[PDB]
Design a protein around this nucleic acid. Structure first.
Ligand SMILES: [Mg+2]
Ligand SMILES: [Mg+2]
Ligand SMILES: [Mg+2]
Ligand SMILES: [Mg+2]
Ligand SMILES: [Mg+2]
Ligand SMILES: [Mg+2]
Ligand SMILES: [Mg+2]
Ligand SMILES: [Mg+2]
Ligand SMILES: [Mg+2]
Ligand SMILES: [Mg+2]
Ligand SMILES: [Mg+2]
Ligand SMILES: [Mg+2]
Ligand SMILES: [Mg+2]
Ligand SMILES: [Mg+2]
Ligand SMILES: [Mg+2]
Ligand SMILES: [Mg+2]
Ligand SMILES: [Mg+2]
Ligand SMILES: [Mg+2]
Ligand SMILES: [Mg+2]
Ligand SMILES: [Mg+2]
Ligand SMILES: [Mg+2]
Ligand SMILES: [Mg+2]
Ligand SMILES: [Mg+2]
Ligand SMILES: [Mg+2]
Ligand SMILES: [Mg+2]
Ligand SMILES: [Mg+2]
Ligand SMILES: [Mg+2]
Ligand SMILES: [Mg+2]
Ligand SMILES: [Mg+2]
Ligand SMILES: [Mg+2]
Ligand SMILES: [Mg+2]
Ligand SMILES: [Mg+2]
Ligand SMILES: [Mg+2]
Ligand SMILES: [Mg+2]
Ligand SMILES: [Mg+2]
Ligand SMILES: [Mg+2]
Ligand SMILES: [Mg+2]
Ligand SMILES: [Mg+2]
Ligand SMILES: [Mg+2]
Ligand SMILES: [Mg+2]
Ligand SMILES: [Mg+2]
Ligand SMILES: [Mg+2]
Ligand SMILES: [Mg+2]
Ligand SMILES: [Mg+2]
Ligand SMILES: [Mg+2]
Ligand SMILES: [Mg+2]
Ligand SMILES: [Mg+2]
Ligand SMILES: [Mg+2]
Ligand SMILES: [Mg+2]
Ligand SMILES: [Mg+2]
Ligand SMILES: [Mg+2]
Ligand SMILES: [Mg+2]
Ligand SMILES: [Mg+2]
Ligand SMILES: [Mg+2]
Ligand SMILES: [Mg+2]
Ligand SMILES: [Mg+2]
Ligand SMILES: [Mg+2]
Ligand SMILES: [Mg+2]
Ligand SMILES: [Mg+2]
Ligand SMILES: [Mg+2]
Ligand SMILES: [Mg+2]
Ligand SMILES: [Mg+2]
Ligand SMILES: [Mg+2]
Ligand SMILES: [Mg+2]
Ligand SMILES: [Mg+2]
Ligand SMILES: [Mg+2]
Ligand SMILES: [Mg+2]
Ligand SMILES: [Mg+2]
Ligand SMILES: [Mg+2]
Ligand SMILES: [Mg+2]
Ligand SMILES: [Mg+2]
Lengths: 114, 118, 56, 209
RNA sequence: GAGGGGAGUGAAAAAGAACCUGAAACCGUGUACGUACAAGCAGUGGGAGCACGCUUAGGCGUGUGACUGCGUACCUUUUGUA
RNA sequence: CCGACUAAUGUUGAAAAAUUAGCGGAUGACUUGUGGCUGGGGGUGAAAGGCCAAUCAAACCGGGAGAUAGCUGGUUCUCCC
RNA sequence: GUCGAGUCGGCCUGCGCGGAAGAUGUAACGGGGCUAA
RNA sequence: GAAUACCAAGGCGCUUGAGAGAACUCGGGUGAAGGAACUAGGCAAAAUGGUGCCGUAACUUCGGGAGAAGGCACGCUGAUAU
RNA sequence: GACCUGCACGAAUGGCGUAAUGAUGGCCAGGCUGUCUCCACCCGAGACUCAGUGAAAUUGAACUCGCUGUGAAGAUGCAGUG
RNA sequence: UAACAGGCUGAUACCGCCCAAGAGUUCAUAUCGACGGCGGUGUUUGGCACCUCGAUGUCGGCUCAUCACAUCCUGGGGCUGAAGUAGGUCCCAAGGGUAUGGCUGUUCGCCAUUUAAAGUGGUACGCGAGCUGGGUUUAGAACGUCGUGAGACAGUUCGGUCCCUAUCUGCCGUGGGCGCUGGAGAACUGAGGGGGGCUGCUCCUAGUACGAGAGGACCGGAGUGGACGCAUCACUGGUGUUCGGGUUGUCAUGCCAAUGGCACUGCCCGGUAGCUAAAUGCGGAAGAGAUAAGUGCUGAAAGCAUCUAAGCACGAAACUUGCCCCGAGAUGAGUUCUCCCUGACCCUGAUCAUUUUUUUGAUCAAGGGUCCUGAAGGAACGUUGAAGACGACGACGUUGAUAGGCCGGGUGUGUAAGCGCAGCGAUGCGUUGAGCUAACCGGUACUAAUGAACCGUGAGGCUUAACCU
């Protein structure tokens, strides 16, 4: 419906960089610890992207301090301050859920030369 | 519940429905008019009309897509060589359904489905 | 599960009080051939809304 | 306080500056036109009857058209009534818009819930299923017992059993008013409201407050 | 075609071969009356109204049965059975 | 091919013992076709009173026979004392 | 020592009061109702 | 491999159909997190599953136990070798 | 696994052991899972609607409500009442 | 004429009360109460043999409950041997709430760990024409034991067929008929009915009141949870055999290339709409009235005293409302707004005006049948829907976006085919984020929603009253 598309368009970020599944991205998110607000980086491989307008999302996987963690970011949320692609990955699927069963060398993603 | 869902099961499984409507689209293209049950004619619209739309653009790839559907090179040839040209300026609605009473064997509601310029 | 008493002819009729068929309220007349037909159906002679749609 | 008739456009979200996402139902509240004022002397109670939207002319019958014409108001798609409070007065033909909620913090929304058709006891009443295995014979989602024995020798009235579910009036109470948009005839309330997209909604200031 | 309507035979075809007589259960069509605020062995006592018909023009006869008193089948077996 | 451990179904069945998914034996004390022999207080039984024509702590058919039944049921028109 | 008409606590007896909580529904007058009905 | 999958020769669609796309039953597919907490009992379901090689405990009647357990490789193309 | 207090073991109607074997009985663990927490969705065959065909058990007769009481002592049929 | 369940009974059982020896420093009665006494329930163990032996399925689990109150929690209160905190005991109170596991067929119980609490009973020890079938209680077998033996044992052990398509009542839903007094389309009122009603923890008040200290509140306020319920799909996800792709075997389309069929959707990886929970919004209340136990004011009978007799005030999750849903078959059938119908008559009667009890014209009817008329609206038919088993309900029918198609987009999959280049080749690379894309969004009359026809009528009873003439 046009009404809701208007309401969503007014809210959408206009500076979202292009990225693809398999890319390594760094997401800067606001973290409030008291009256202190600061930026914390979450860097990992994009294993899923949901293209849904204002409701678009993407999932980033990383191994952190010995533990695998996934964060599903809401793309247009003000919690997300900036997104930057650190490395272009070459994969063929849209969804990289198979990486959940890979570690180390078996988890490597070929760089996308382009 | 079947909210917003499309498509008739027609008391068949999906592979049977697919084969049946491949055959029936072939028959309608061949004869330009067939008699079937009303629900089947209404479902058949959704199969035959996109085939004619595809046939509007003649290319190797489109002929191969038409063959993957239909599996009949006589049907594909008629599509691209005659029906696409015949319907080149018609925006949809290449078929017409005409209700024609009830079947003797089973009181099934019946209809003719024909190409509009037959 | 089965009746303990034989239902009466009266109860049988009361149940069938909803079984009566409904006649077609009105037949339509083709504007060209003048023959009667079911509304929105073709005529016996292949006419619909004045047009000879089906031959033979 | 009176309310307004709107339409369920759908749901979306509002992102706030501090990173909260507020789920909102978007309600289109076009101008509500007063078609009849009812008073104690003539009707036994105080109320306004309103209309909203529009209806195709050949779909309006002569009785309904005469009723609209007496108000001097174009035909809407239906008629709804709101009871009047003591300090509340309105005139026939008056237009009431969504700025009525400009200062209202919370609203009650009434719609016709989606229709689930004939529902089993598991879906309709949250009955538990019996064993999927362990010998269960044909009795996996069935209700179980429906009573006692010879005493009382009957099933009690109101026994929970399978039947029609949904497609009924439902009220959700005290929803936050997120935004009133007079220019676009929009009310955004936090959270879900009854009914499918496009269906009519009745919005009134929250009774609990 | 089955089946039927006539025509004809015959004392008779409502003796037509699914055939003398043609009962009852059971199932229909027609007409009269009753019946959609009313609780139970369905009748019985009381009883209005309606329809049809009667040689005295009067009530009566036939059918129905609003409403109302009373009223828990039959057999068997039992101390005793709705 | 011969079986029949478990479950679901079926239970006025598709079937008076099955179907489906699984299951055991599968060169042997194996399994099968044709024909033969053993007969009812009798047969046969790697023994369950198992089997002996959908019948088994004594087969089936006919006869004694209308066994007997201190038991159950039922017992038909009327009125008067 | 203070007020001016009774005061006290035993007995016998008529009628009542408490003691008195149960399971589908009033539900321990047949009902309505009754201070006599 | 007389298993199994798809086919040939050949033979068939099983003698009611048409719609719809509720509960519930039957036969199946998949399932977040958990993982026997179910239950009389893991009933049912899920799972394992091939070949080659490496490797394999107690115990033993010296045959076994044992395919114990556990693990690695596995398609296609080219060369060695038109 | 022990103890021995064997109600009421015990030596071919065998005692005690025993590798292997078992669609045998009990207990435990890994794996695995809709068995379960707690169910959701889906694909099919019925169920539902139309056309054709067309059963059954049962059945004293029925104008076949609740409640409290009564009563061959657990009532649609009795009383009162709703 | 026994076993189950019912019935009668209530010794027994469970609960309540009376007397008060005594315990309790003192002090019978805060708490407990000896020796005895009196009741209630139907509730255990029983008694009886009235119902059922031409059959009333009997343990436990599961599912689903419903009622009582002798109350487990939460609520209100009196006394206390009640400082506080926390208890004891009794009274009121049935609104709502009221564990998961290990063992065992268990119920129970014990045990582990929860909880505000893990209530006690009735309901054929509720519930097998709802499930199970572990136990009891057939036929096989064995042990111990008894018996000469066949066999036997509320001793044990291993194994061991649970049928019914619902006529009636009842119950959950959903239509059809007629009625409600001319017909019709809507909006209502609200008699009456149903739902809902639980509660933790943390912080503040306050380390205050209390207390030697240890500890540690009432009253009131704030937040955030468990369980439960309703709605919804924006988000996070499941499903997604109707979308895209990878891949094994085989068969075919002449072959290559490219495709299709079959193998559980062959096996898989993703995934649109919808449906949905694990996802996320919301709810229980406040307030009001009348009260329970309880507390009182004023106040005599009875010069005192006395909450009570007259009068007056407080007082709880119970009651009546407040909140949500149904609701005029509420036959007591209600109200409001709007819309529509303004013929010839005959037959015959009713009245009248005329008569000669009979008759000669006019007007009008809760008769009847024909003629003309056919409205408002409805139904039907068609295209249909997040509406739906069917009916029903909603949208739309050319003066049209109802459905299909079509166009644009989105989404998903993930760089099609063809051609070219590199490589001996598998394959890689370019064209190319390509191709394809369901149920989605925005649009669009191309197709199908036909002119008609059908139903429904023509001013709507009597009386009386208030008015208008
Ligand atoms: Mg649709
Ligand atoms: Mg079918
Ligand atoms: Mg297939
Ligand atoms: Mg009987
Ligand atoms: Mg019928
Ligand atoms: Mg629905
Ligand atoms: Mg459960
Ligand atoms: Mg069975
Ligand atoms: Mg089952
Ligand atoms: Mg003839
Ligand atoms: Mg003769
Ligand atoms: Mg005869
Ligand atoms: Mg009547
Ligand atoms: Mg009444
Ligand atoms: Mg009587
Ligand atoms: Mg007797
Ligand atoms: Mg008697
Ligand atoms: Mg055998
Ligand atoms: Mg088998
Ligand atoms: Mg073996
Ligand atoms: Mg073998
Ligand atoms: Mg024996
Ligand atoms: Mg035999
Ligand atoms: Mg003998
Ligand atoms: Mg003799
Ligand atoms: Mg004899
Ligand atoms: Mg009571
Ligand atoms: Mg084979
Ligand atoms: Mg289905
Ligand atoms: Mg299933
Ligand atoms: Mg599965
Ligand atoms: Mg799972
Ligand atoms: Mg998982
Ligand atoms: Mg695990
Ligand atoms: Mg367990
Ligand atoms: Mg358990
Ligand atoms: Mg198993
Ligand atoms: Mg399996
Ligand atoms: Mg021995
Ligand atoms: Mg010896
Ligand atoms: Mg031995
Ligand atoms: Mg039929
Ligand atoms: Mg009756
Ligand atoms: Mg009763
Ligand atoms: Mg009774
Ligand atoms: Mg007894
Ligand atoms: Mg007893
Ligand atoms: Mg006696
Ligand atoms: Mg009895
Ligand atoms: Mg009997
Ligand atoms: Mg009490
Ligand atoms: Mg109550
Ligand atoms: Mg209350
Ligand atoms: Mg326990
Ligand atoms: Mg265990
Ligand atoms: Mg019981
Ligand atoms: Mg109980
Ligand atoms: Mg059963
Ligand atoms: Mg039962
Ligand atoms: Mg034995
Ligand atoms: Mg209630
Ligand atoms: Mg969505
Ligand atoms: Mg997903
Ligand atoms: Mg999938
Ligand atoms: Mg596919
Ligand atoms: Mg090829
Ligand atoms: Mg094939
Ligand atoms: Mg094949
Ligand atoms: Mg005084
Ligand atoms: Mg497109
Ligand atoms: Mg491809």
């Amino acid at each position: 419906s046009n009404i809701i598309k208007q309401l969503e368009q007014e809210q959408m970020k206009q500076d979202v960089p292009s990225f693809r599944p398999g890319d390594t991205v760094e997401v800067k998110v606001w973290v409030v610890e008291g009256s202190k607000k600061r930026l914390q980086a979450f860097e990992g491989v994009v294993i899923a992207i949901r293209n849904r307008g204002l409701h678009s999302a993407f999932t980033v996987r990383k191994i952190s301090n010995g533990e695998g963690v996934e964060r599903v970011f809401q793309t247009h949320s003000p919690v997300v301050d900036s997104i930057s692609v650190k490395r272009r990955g070459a994969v063929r699927k849209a969804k990289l859920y198979y990486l959940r069963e890979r570690t180390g060398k078996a988890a490597r993603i070929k760089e996308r030369l382009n | 519940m079947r909210h917003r869902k499309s498509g008739r099961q027609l008391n068949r499984n999906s592979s049977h429905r697919q084969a049946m409507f491949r055959n029936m689209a072939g028959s309608l293209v061949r004869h330009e008019i067939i008699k079937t049950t009303l629900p089947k004619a209404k479902e058949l619209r959704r199969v035959v009309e996109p085939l004619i739309t595809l046939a509007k653009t003649d290319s190797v790839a489109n002929r191969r897509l038409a063959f993957a559907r239909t599996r009949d090179n006589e049907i594909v040839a008629k599509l691209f060589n005659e029906l696409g040209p015949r319907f080149a300026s018609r925006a949809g609605g290449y078929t017409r359904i005409l209700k024609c009473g009830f079947r003797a064997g089973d009181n099934a509601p019946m209809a003719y489905i024909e190409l509009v310029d037959r | 599960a089965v009746q303990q008493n034989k239902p009466t002819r009266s109860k049988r009729g009361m149940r069938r009080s909803h079984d009566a068929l409904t006649a077609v309220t009105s037949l339509s007349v083709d504007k060209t051939s003048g023959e009667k037909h079911l509304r929105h159906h073709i005529t016996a002679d292949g006419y619909y809304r004045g047009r000879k749609v089906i031959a033979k | 306080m009176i309310g307004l008739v709107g339409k369920k456009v759908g749901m979306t979200r509002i992102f706030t500056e501090d990173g909260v996402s507020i789920p909102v139902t978007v309600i289109e509240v076009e101008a509500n036109r007063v078609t009849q004022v009812k008073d104690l002397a003539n009707d036994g109670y105080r109320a306004i009857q309103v209309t909203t939207g529009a209806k195709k002319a050949n779909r309006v019958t002569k009785p309904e058209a005469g009723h609209f014409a007496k108000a001097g108001v174009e035909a809407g798609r239906g008629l709804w009534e709101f009871r009047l409070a003591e300090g509340e007065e309105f005139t026939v033909g008056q237009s009431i818009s969504v700025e009525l909620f400009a200062d209202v913090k919370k609203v009650d929304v009434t719609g016709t819930s989606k229709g689930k058709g004939f529902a089993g006891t598991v879906k309709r009443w949250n009955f538990r299923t019996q064993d999927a295995t362990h010998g269960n014979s044909l009795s996996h989602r069935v209700p179980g017992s429906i009573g006692q024995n010879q005493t009382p020798g009957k099933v009690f009235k109101g026994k929970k059993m399978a039947g029609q579910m949904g497609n009924e009036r439902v009220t959700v109470q005290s929803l936050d008013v997120v935004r009133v948009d007079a220019e676009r005839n929009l009310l955004l309330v936090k959270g879900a409201v009854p009914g499918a997209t496009g269906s009519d909604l009745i919005v009134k200031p929250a009774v609990k407050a």
